[PDB]
Amino acid sequence: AKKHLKRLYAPKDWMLSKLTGVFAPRPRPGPHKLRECLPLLVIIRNRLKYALNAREGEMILRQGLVHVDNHPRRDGKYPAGFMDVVEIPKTGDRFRLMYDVKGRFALVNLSEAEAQIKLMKVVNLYTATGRVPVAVTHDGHRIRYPDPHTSIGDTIVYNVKEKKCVDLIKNRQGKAVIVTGGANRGRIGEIVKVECHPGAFNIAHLKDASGAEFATRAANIFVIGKDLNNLQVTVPKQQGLRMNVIQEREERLIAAEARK
């Protein structure tokens, strides 16, 4: 099977320079999809800058100094992804892997009693041997006894340290969601309606805080709160609000001139 990953073929969100190397670290199979993940080596070397190169990254990772969802992960090819909690106890670092308004990965700093909570979107529900209902989540977790009201597309806020479900947010109109894929990835809005096309892709029509209306496929939405006012997780700085490109360029130019 494929063991390598050309740097040109690597996801653009990893921000690896096309001139520095032929290859990029190929994510191993695991919790998240290869195209929708951030490798641990990329996090430790290119984002956190704790490692100058891969050899120092190996030094840090093999010692189990980096924890993902309250578990040391020693593989630099481990596929960390959305809503994962990454903690380095030695440096006192705690952040959640999320998407900013531009669709890039963002390390949102977390406090204690916040790093113990992780949201998981239910992608499948089946019955195991012994008539045991099992819920499969977006990060590959299998839950042996979910809430009876759990449905596919819902989100389970899950205590990683105690390994137990603590609450469930249903996937209904009026709920706050974050887009996890497509051109609208990273936007935060409220479900206005969901159009159902059986045998095809359901379309979710959303509306952000400023009132902008956008759409995507139902697979790309991720419920994160009862409504936009009360979210169940800390979001990045820009709060999932897409901002006009012309206005953004003008504000950056003014801010740059104010600095100098």
């Binding site: 704790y50 100058l52 120092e56 030094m59 030695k90 440096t91």
Partner: protein, 130 residues
């Protein structure tokens, strides 16, 4: 308008970060050498940084990648300040340790190693390695 004065070196650090994982502190080091003739030796920069950052031993300071600025008078590099000499000798790359005199001896030519490996792969035990 020219005046003859002794050349002086000013050290200046940016993007400073504390790396508890590798027991060191990382920073970009910029050297201002107005009337310096040629390039500032990295050993001299090591003494200046050790004094500037109150490092008891200059041997815990690791410097590399010094690029001089076009037009002269400036040099920019990268610096590492380790908590102790033991941490430096344990975590630093061998070639930088060799630059400091702490490196190991060079291994034999890899071609000879490849030659020996190919010869040995035709033999059974007690002949391989001889």
């Amino acid at each position: 308008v020219f005046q003859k004065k002794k050349a002086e070196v000013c050290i200046r650090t940016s993007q400073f970060k504390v790396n508890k994982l590798l027991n060191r502190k990382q920073f970009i080091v910029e050297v201002n050498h107005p009337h310096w003739c040629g390039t500032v030796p990295t050993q001299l920069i090591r003494k200046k940084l050790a004094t500037l950052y109150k490092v008891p031993d200059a041997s815990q300071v690791s410097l590399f990648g010094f690029k001089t600025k076009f037009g002269g008078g400036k040099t920019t590099g990268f610096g590492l300040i380790y908590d102790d000499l033991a941490s430096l000798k344990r975590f630093e790359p061998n070639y930088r340790k060799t630059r400091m005199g702490f490196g190991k001896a060079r291994l034999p030519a890899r071609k000879s190693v490849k030659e020996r490996r190919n010869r040995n792969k035709k033999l059974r035990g007690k002949a391989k390695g001889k």
